[PDB]
Amino acid sequence: MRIEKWVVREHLDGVPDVNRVYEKVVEDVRIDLRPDEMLFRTRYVSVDPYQNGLALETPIGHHMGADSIMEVVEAGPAAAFAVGDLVQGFGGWRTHVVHNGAEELWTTGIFPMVFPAYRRLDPSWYGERLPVSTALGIMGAPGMTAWGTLTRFLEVRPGDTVVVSGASGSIGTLVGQLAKRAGAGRVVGTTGSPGKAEYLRELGFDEVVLYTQGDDAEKVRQALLLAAPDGVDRYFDNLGGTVTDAVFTMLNVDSRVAVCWQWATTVNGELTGPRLLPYIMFPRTTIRGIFAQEWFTEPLLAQMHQELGGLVRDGEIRYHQTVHKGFDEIPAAYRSLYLDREHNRGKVLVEV
Amino acid sequence: MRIEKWVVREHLDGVPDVNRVYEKVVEDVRIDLRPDEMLFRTRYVSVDPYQNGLALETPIGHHMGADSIMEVVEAGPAAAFAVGDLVQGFGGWRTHVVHNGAEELWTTGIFPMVFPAYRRLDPSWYGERLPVSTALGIMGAPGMTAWGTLTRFLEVRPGDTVVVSGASGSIGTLVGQLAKRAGAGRVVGTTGSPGKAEYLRELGFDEVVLYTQGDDAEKVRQALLLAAPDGVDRYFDNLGGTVTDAVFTMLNVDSRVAVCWQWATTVNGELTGPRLLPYIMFPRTTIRGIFAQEWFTEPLLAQMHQELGGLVRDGEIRYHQTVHKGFDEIPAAYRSLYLDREHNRGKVLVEV
């Protein structure tokens, strides 16, 4: 049984040379399934900006974690899933996985984490216009981060001014389109690079505010004032930082703010990224922290595949995904994420 | 008229020489109120450990911010309050204040803040057994932090195991007492010193775990396991950090966690304190950030004064507070927080 994986060869903080951080290891392994274990064959793996920080918290010689789509090829007598099933879970950069599917408490990073339980993909969900690979994108955690927030919390009302930070990411772009469909009077997106500025409005959006992280809070506030003259009613925060401090100076009464959970990393030794608790003192605001897998329930996953999946199939919504081909292409796919900030998750996959 | 105020003289981190950080300034003014302004006479001020961090963010020469109780002695024709009214607000360490009582956006600190609008005190709320000075303690924001959480969020039930971090402070000891009244099967508190452990068991704590920050992440977990053998149903978090990380490994299904907002504080130029967003990814749990002023509505303030105030008069709930006498005593009172017996001094106030 030939099993291959990409493991952390060295701890290096944000370097372009992927082949210095990662090393492929190959070995024959005898599988002796415990009674509730399954043998999985990886079909797709996600490649995301956060894996730079995750590598730093991964023991040398261990494989890199990743969201993946896996096929059950052998199941013990007490296993959760059947042979032939397609399963989405945190399988990692591995050709094959032995696992029982349960949640995993991981306590050696910055904060403790529970990796979600593996979940069965419904065979009837996917077709030619909505393939299985979308389970790591618009039909998986990235899609649900955007879609679940709009349908379960944000309460976009007609005429509302909606601000989306990280609007050039797949998740933020989706939030912006769904907000306009809800009839938002104005949808404002922030971005770092004016290249997409014309491109965001092309996507949707009424206005785009140019913003890199190292910008003055006063300087971004003035840009937001100009793009949102009537104040901000709704904020979807996939970025954190200076832009969020400015939005909170211009919220209207009874505003609603979604702040997205992101993997914990430290650039310059301190934590950047989204924050929630400092802001809940603000009067007459409702703030919710967002984590897609909270809504990975049977009915909501069915409703998302139905309504949002139906929007994709009818060509009303498109979610750009880049799928490289072959297990050996993982370092290349990862290297292509150089220049992508942490909010850009869910774009690049590898088909094994 | 002479108005005196304690101003920030210099910026010094750590336990400061109060005579170096603060200086008394005197000014002979004549008052000229705009139509919505009032002249207030300060009756009581609070002194609090957060004023160290706030002083570092206060421009040199500006007065030290503080929650206070103030009396309207002059009012413009369009003012919110009438002469003789008693009002609670962030008036600061000043003998007298000219203010219209409005909210204040303050953006010079680590995160933006909105100081609440001044609020009027119903003098009927208070009396011999419940003095008006408790509007800065058990009848005010500190008390509402504990009481509001228990009545509106935490859902403590007969048999529940409740953990309270930072249990020795006023809010912690009030939560423990109220949790025991709600019928909690096991109330567990953590504290920084073995001496206060005995008074806690007097108030209603069934066990006390000793914990100083910078303790062993696993030793704290082991100690919580022994003190809460049945899992943690409810968590009232005053501290953040290693105790909260240990607690999140032993929550029972459908647990509920309250994380208290606190003034944003720097440790060695880094980060410490309660955190909320990293933990929302944990499944089968409800986490809410707590900020008492959220519940400063007409119905809930009356309810608390009737119900919680009733328990104070009947001796069912035990609080304490040290009230210093004299505007000139304010720096010394603040210094007292860093000396000893605070775990026995409770809320510190200065009558002015």
Side-chain angles (χ1 to χ4, degrees), chain A residues 103 114 261 271 277 280-281, chain B residues 114 245 261 275 278 281 284 289:
Chain A
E103 316 179 327
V114 168
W261 180 97
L271 286 157
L277 186 61
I280 65 124
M281 61 99 56
Chain B
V114 170
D245 291 337
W261 181 94
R275 300 285 304 272
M281 68 96 68
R284 302 179 301 278

Side-chain angles (χ1 to χ4, degrees), chain A residues 264-285:
Chain A
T265 53
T266 49
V267 183
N268 217 320
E270 53 249 21
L271 286 157
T272 45
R275 300 284 301 272
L276 194 168
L277 186 61
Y279 303 107
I280 65 124
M281 61 99 56
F282 271 78
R284 296 186 84 178
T285 193

Side-chain angles (χ1 to χ4, degrees), chain A residues 3 43 48 57 60 110 117 120 130 145 181 193 210 222 224 226 291 297 305 318 321 350:
Chain A
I3 291 198
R43 311 313 290 143
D48 289 302
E57 297 296 332
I60 307 264
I110 294 174
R120 177 181 163 258
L130 192 77
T145 297
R181 292 190 53 98
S193 38
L210 285 318
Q222 297 204 20
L224 288 152
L226 288 186
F291 184 72
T297 76
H305 284 89
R318 159 162 47 226
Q321 207 133 45
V350 174

Side-chain angles (χ1 to χ4, degrees), chain B residues 10 49 233 282 329:
Chain B
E10 198 180 352
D233 293 306
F282 274 73
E329 272 303 280

Side-chain angles (χ1 to χ4, degrees), chain B residues 154-215:
Chain B
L154 201 57
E155 300 183 1
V156 171
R157 305 162 301 176
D160 282 346
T161 296
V162 178
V163 183
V164 181
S165 57
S168 78
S170 59
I171 290 165
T173 67
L174 182 56
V175 167
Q177 283 175 85
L178 293 180
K180 194 62 121 59
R181 278 188 65 85
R186 193 144 185 94
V187 178
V188 187
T190 68
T191 189
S193 96
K196 27 210 188 172
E198 187 185 350
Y199 182 39
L200 295 175
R201 327 192 196 251
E202 287 209 278
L203 287 158
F205 286 87
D206 307 295
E207 199 166 344
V208 192
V209 165
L210 291 172
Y211 171 80
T212 56
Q213 289 174 343
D215 266 20

Side-chain angles (χ1 to χ4, degrees), chain A residues 22 79 90 100 109 151 154 179 188 220 227 284 314 320 337 341-342:
Chain A
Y22 299 106
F90 208 61
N100 67 357
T151 66
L154 199 51
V188 181
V220 63
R284 296 186 84 178
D314 310 334
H320 300 291
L337 293 195
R341 310 200 123 88
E342 303 284 295

Side-chain angles (χ1 to χ4, degrees), chain A residues 238-289:
Chain A
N238 203 194
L239 201 56
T242 284
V243 58
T244 294
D245 300 333
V247 169
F248 271 77
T249 67
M250 58 182 73
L251 297 169
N252 288 336
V253 299
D254 297 339
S255 63
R256 305 177 68 78
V257 180
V259 180
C260 290
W261 180 97
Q262 287 175 12
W263 281 78
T265 53
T266 49
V267 183
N268 217 320
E270 53 249 21
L271 286 157
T272 45
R275 300 284 301 272
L276 194 168
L277 186 61
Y279 303 107
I280 65 124
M281 61 99 56
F282 271 78
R284 296 186 84 178
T285 193
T286 305
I287 310 185
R288 184 174 175 170

Side-chain angles (χ1 to χ4, degrees), chain B:
Chain B
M1 69 167 303
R2 185 166 73 212
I3 296 185
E4 311 189 3
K5 54 192 220 282
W6 282 105
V7 306
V8 174
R9 162 131 62 190
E10 198 180 352
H11 288 146
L12 291 314
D13 195 22
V15 172
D17 193 352
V18 86
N19 291 341
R20 298 205 64 219
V21 171
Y22 303 109
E23 148 174 20
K24 205 179 70 165
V25 169
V26 300
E27 157 71 9
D28 269 90
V29 271
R30 298 163 156 277
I31 301 304
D32 183 25
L33 303 175
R34 319 276 46 91
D36 62 332
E37 291 182 323
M38 294 149 289
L39 175 64
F40 297 91
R41 176 179 176 184
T42 297
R43 285 302 194 165
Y44 296 93
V45 299
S46 180
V47 299
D48 302 85
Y50 70 79
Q51 288 170 317
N52 178 66
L54 179 53
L56 300 180
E57 292 294 339
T58 301
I60 302 295
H62 287 22
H63 79 271
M64 176 75 255
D67 270 322
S68 62
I69 294 173
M70 298 159 276
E71 184 192 331
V72 177
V73 295
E74 186 176 336
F81 308 115
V83 167
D85 281 353
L86 289 177
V87 151
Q88 192 277 312
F90 204 64
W93 296 350
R94 302 181 278 188
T95 57
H96 298 82
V97 177
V98 174
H99 206 278
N100 66 7
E103 310 177 329
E104 180 190 337
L105 174 67
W106 172 71
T107 47
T108 88
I110 303 177
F111 294 99
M113 295 187 64
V114 170
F115 299 165
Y118 295 8
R119 62 192 184 86
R120 173 163 3 133
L121 304 168
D122 187 347
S124 80
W125 287 342
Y126 304 115
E128 283 273 60
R129 304 175 286 170
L130 192 70
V132 63
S133 70
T134 60
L136 296 170
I138 193 159
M139 281 315 102
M144 179 66 83
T145 307
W147 184 84
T149 301
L150 268 83
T151 55
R152 310 292 280 163
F153 170 67
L154 201 57
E155 300 183 1
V156 171
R157 305 162 301 176
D160 282 346
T161 296
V162 178
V163 183
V164 181
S165 57
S168 78
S170 59
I171 290 165
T173 67
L174 182 56
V175 167
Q177 283 175 85
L178 293 180
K180 194 62 121 59
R181 278 188 65 85
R186 193 144 185 94
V187 178
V188 187
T190 68
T191 189
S193 96
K196 27 210 188 172
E198 187 185 350
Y199 182 39
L200 295 175
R201 327 192 196 251
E202 287 209 278
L203 287 158
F205 286 87
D206 307 295
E207 199 166 344
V208 192
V209 165
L210 291 172
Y211 171 80
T212 56
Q213 289 174 343
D215 266 20
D216 185 333
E218 182 69 354
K219 187 208 83 43
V220 185
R221 194 187 65 86
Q222 272 319 315
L224 287 177
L225 288 179
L226 296 192
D230 287 325
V232 175
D233 293 306
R234 303 289 185 272
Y235 183 30
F236 186 95
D237 187 10
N238 275 309
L239 308 170
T242 289
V243 171
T244 289
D245 291 337
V247 162
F248 268 83
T249 68
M250 64 193 58
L251 298 173
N252 287 334
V253 60
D254 296 324
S255 63
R256 302 175 71 85
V257 178
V259 174
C260 285
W261 181 94
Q262 295 172 8
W263 289 79
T265 303
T266 169
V267 61
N268 209 333
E270 291 295 327
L271 181 47
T272 193
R275 300 285 304 272
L276 193 162
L277 192 63
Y279 305 105
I280 72 110
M281 68 96 68
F282 274 73
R284 302 179 301 278
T285 197
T286 301
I287 308 175
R288 176 173 184 173
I290 304 299
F291 182 74
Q293 276 80 353
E294 207 188 343
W295 295 304
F296 279 8
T297 70
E298 177 171 347
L300 293 173
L301 283 165
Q303 183 179 1
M304 180 174 66
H305 279 81
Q306 193 219 326
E307 301 185 4
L308 180 51
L311 300 186
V312 178
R313 306 170 151 112
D314 306 9
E316 297 270 25
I317 290 297
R318 293 169 38 170
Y319 76 104
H320 73 267
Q321 54 177 36
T322 314
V323 180
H324 299 251
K325 279 165 307 200
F327 189 78
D328 285 318
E329 272 303 280
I330 289 166
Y334 174 74
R335 176 192 323 134
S336 83
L337 304 168
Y338 304 102
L339 310 188
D340 331 86
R341 196 137 288 264
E342 272 310 313
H343 59 310
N344 325 306
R345 292 220 258 287
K347 189 72 201 71
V348 184
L349 311 168
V350 181
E351 172 182 26
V352 172

